[PDB]
Design an enzyme around this catalytic site. Sequence first.
Site, PDB file in Angstrom:
ATOM      1  CB  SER A  49      58.878  94.692  62.161  1.00 29.76           C
ATOM      2  OG  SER A  49      59.197  93.336  61.916  1.00 29.76           O
ATOM      3  CE  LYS A  52      54.876  92.853  61.225  1.00 28.29           C
ATOM      4  NZ  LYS A  52      56.333  92.696  61.397  1.00 28.29           N
ATOM      5  CB  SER A 298      56.101  93.142  65.415  1.00 28.56           C
ATOM      6  OG  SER A 298      56.809  93.359  64.194  1.00 28.56           O
ATOM      7  CE  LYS A 410      55.559  96.923  64.354  1.00 31.01           C
ATOM      8  NZ  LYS A 410      56.765  96.279  64.989  1.00 31.01           N
TER       9      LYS A 410
END
Length: 466
Positions: A49, A52, A298, A410
């Site tokens: 992820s 993203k 997420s 993140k």
Amino acid sequence: RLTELREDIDAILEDPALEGAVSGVVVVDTATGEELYSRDGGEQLLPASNMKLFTAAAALEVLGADHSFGTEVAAESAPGRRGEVQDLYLVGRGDPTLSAEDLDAMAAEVAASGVRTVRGDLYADDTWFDSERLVDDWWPEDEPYAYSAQISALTVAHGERFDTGVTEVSVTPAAEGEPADVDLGAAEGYAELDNRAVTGAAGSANTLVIDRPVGTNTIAVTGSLPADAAPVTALRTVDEPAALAGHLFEEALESNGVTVKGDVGLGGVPADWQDAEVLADHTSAELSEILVPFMKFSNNGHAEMLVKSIGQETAGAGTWDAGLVGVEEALSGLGVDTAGLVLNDGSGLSRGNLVTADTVVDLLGQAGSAPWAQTWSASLPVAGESDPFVGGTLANRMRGTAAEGVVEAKTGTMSGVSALSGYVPGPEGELAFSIVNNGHSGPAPLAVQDAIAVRLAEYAGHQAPE
Ligand SMILES: [Co+2]
Ligand SMILES: [Co+2]
């Protein structure tokens, strides 16, 4: 100070949890441009992820922080003195945050505009994006789970996190020996029920399984739920999110005293339609606000919807092919060197994605002086923050360390893949870091990642809150 920081990260990365793993680790002082630490910085790794990050930046460049999304309801002409239309169309244009209440309010507008009867059929129009529901290399076995929801232009978002294309399944125990009660949520009368689940004796073992078998729109519930057990609630995906949207709109309409006499299904506005009468509409909040639930938790579905929305904006094509090129071009236009990048989706679910830790940091630097730098920054999880909409996927990580409240980063974990990338502000300059782990063989190396983020926070001149 720098020489010792290198020794410290060296030792941290010597952890047994990283056995057989390749780890891209890059650290940069974002003011000077000084590379403080680099190891396998140009190595190509699955980002999970962390992907993203690239998507969010590109959506802000292509769509803008001001961008919102629309859903509307359309008949061939306005309702009569009789208050009758023939066919009605619910039309979605990529809104990743469209609620059941939003459908109710549009139903109220259809009524307030003078419709009392839909004599023909209700169609759900999701033709703004293509009907490729899932990416090529995503795993069929993941398909019942919310993070693997089918992708559509017309999808109903569940809850305040805005989990798209799913229904909340609730299983309640009854008397020992009686079937458990299954509540399909929004998908009641849409998804099929196969309830094989029993209620077990009080204090027995809980063996309850909620499945959607592959290529069906059936919720299959097997196993035992103990009589003394708490209800089990689970988000499960549906086939054809737009069809469920159409279904819920039908009920919304009927609930607002509008009789729908025909069927519910998929269909696009005929174009035969000279000038379609818009009987209701809804506008999402703007992308900057939407970025928060998206990035903090997420959200896979948001990411893939944003890619198709980018495709529509750059190319008029709500398509992974179009939208993914649009991501790449936006990042290039941003000043990012995309050589090491392989884009296969927007979410990072795909094991076809490659980043390098050098690329991630590059982007983190470029994003920091973009006009949208603050909306971007606000969307990221904040280490150790209690509030789920603040801490996000980092809410229960790095509490009582120098990182708590400072590190904006993140996350991204799959089997054999973990990542942490973001910013470390402080008295001693603001840092960008990327930690990308691949090929490790047990639990995600989250403690190793925390350890690094924590050390960098300390290096940036922070101390643990007490
Ligand atoms: Co229903
Ligand atoms: Co601190």
